[PDB]
Structure 1
Amino acid sequence: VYAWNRKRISNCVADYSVLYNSASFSTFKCYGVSPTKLNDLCFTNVYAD
């Protein structure tokens, strides 16, 4: 965590419903957007830290 790794996400189609309904996750929270609504949006970029 002292050297956290950032991945730029671009040029692509996501599915955040597949993420937030995944059995893999023990906690999931969102800010400035609500997770139910993410599949209706677009972004100039996404970054994963």
Structure 2
Amino acid sequence: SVLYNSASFSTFKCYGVSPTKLNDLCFTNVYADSFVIRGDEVRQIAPGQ
């Protein structure tokens, strides 16, 4: 709820699950990965592009 009720970020599109009720499933593993790019290429964070 800290992350998905902070609206300051620009894109929140979740695959295979859904944001609002992510607070429902209990997870095996979560990997956090970060990087820096241009804001053109937010389409290239996508399956099949």
What TM bracket, shorter-length normalisation?
0.5 to 0.7
Aligned length: 33
Match of 1:41 in 2: 25
Kindly state the Cα deviation for residue 34 of structure 1 after the two structures are TM-superposed.
0.5
Poorly superposed stretches of 4+, deviation over 4 Å: none
The normalised TM-score by structure 1 is 0.57
Kindly state the Cα deviation for residue 18 of structure 1 after the two structures are TM-superposed.
1.4
Instruction: Name the one with the larger helix percent.
Output: 1
- Percent of aligned pairs with the same residue? 100
User: Is there any run of 5+ residues in structure 2 with no aligned partner, and where?
Assistant: 34-49
